[PDB]
Write a structure and sequence with these properties.
Name: Alpha-ketoglutarate-dependent dioxygenase AlkB
Order of helices and strands: EHEEEHEEEEEEEE
Strand content: 25-35%
Number of strands: 12
CATH superfamily: Alpha-ketoglutarate-dependent dioxygenase AlkB-like
CATH class: Mainly Beta
CATH architecture: Sandwich
Shape: globular
CATH topology: Jelly Rolls
PDB class: oxidoreductase
Bound molecules: 2-oxoglutaric acid, manganese (II) ion
Strand order of the largest sheet: 1-10-7-12-5-2
Number of domains: 1
Keywords: Jelly-roll fold, Demethylase, oxidoreductase
Helix content: 10-25%
Entry title: Iron-Catalyzed Oxidation Intermediates Captured in A DNA Repair Dioxygenase
Assembly: trimeric
Length: 201
DNA sequence: AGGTAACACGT
DNA sequence: AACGGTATTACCT
């Protein structure tokens, strides 16, 4: 096992990938990918957007889940049924049959893009797991512990891989190392990740 | 009190 | 380039 309460389901989303990617494009046509600026004033290397009832965003004052896209000033697009179904099946396979996400953060990684080691704790109900779907180019996922200096596991995540963490491992530090350039026939030159959460009550 | 930015340079 | 400092503070509510 990846950790207590955590598992990787390799190639779980492989068969669903083409549809998922069509729906990413549909979501982004309404709420475009944007590289967000941290409260500290740095532009993130990962480009992001959201779908579902709540979207993760930065602002001057910190991080926030909000029902409105601050760039368009309209609600985030509805969560595609392909996304919701894949998430439900993955969560069930990982031992979290009751998971009901209300938020999906869509990450796009160009070569060089990274996500520094962090915890997912913007969500009030820590009982719900995180379901994380990889698409396109491969990336090295770091998965640690409750403390930043806890030893890291480094796992390659490839197209279609799904990682789920929760319970004892819900607050574990994790991240993505700078993406290697490459080619993938479905995403061409990038990696996408879908991160499903229950962000509200 | 407690929340929490850093989902972001030097060795 | 893997590891860890920084928030060891200065603000909010
Ligand atoms: O891209 C990934 O695999 C991880 C994304 C992530 O950690 C997040 O969106 O909070
Ligand atoms: Mn995360």
């Amino acid at each position: 096992p990846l950790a207590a309460g955590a598992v990787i389901l390799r190639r779980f989303a492989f068969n669903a990938a083409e549809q998922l990617i069509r729906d990413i494009n549909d979501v982004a046509s309404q709420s475009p990918f944007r590289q967000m600026v941290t409260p500290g004033g740095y532009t993130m290397s990962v480009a992001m957007t959201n779908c579902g009832h709540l979207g993760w965003t930065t602002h001057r004052q910190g991080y926030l889940y909000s029902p409105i896209d601050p760039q368009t000033n309209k609600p985030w697009p509805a969560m595609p049924q392909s996304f919701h179904n894949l998430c439900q099946r993955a969560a069930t396979a990982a031992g979290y049959p009751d998971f009901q996400p209300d938020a999906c953060l869509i990450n796009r990684y160009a070569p060089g893009a990274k996500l520094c080691l962090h915890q997912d704790k913007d969500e009030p109900d820590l009982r719900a797991p995180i379901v994380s779907v990889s698409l396109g180019l491969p990336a090295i996922f770091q998965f640690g512990g409750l403390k930043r200096n806890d030893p890291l596991k480094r796992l390659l995540l490839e197209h279609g891989d799904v990682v789920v963490w929760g319970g004892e491992s819900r607050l574990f530090y994790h991240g993505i190392q700078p993406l290697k350039a490459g080619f993938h026939p479905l995403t061409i030159d990038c990696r996408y990740n879908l991160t499903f959460r229950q962000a509200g009550k």
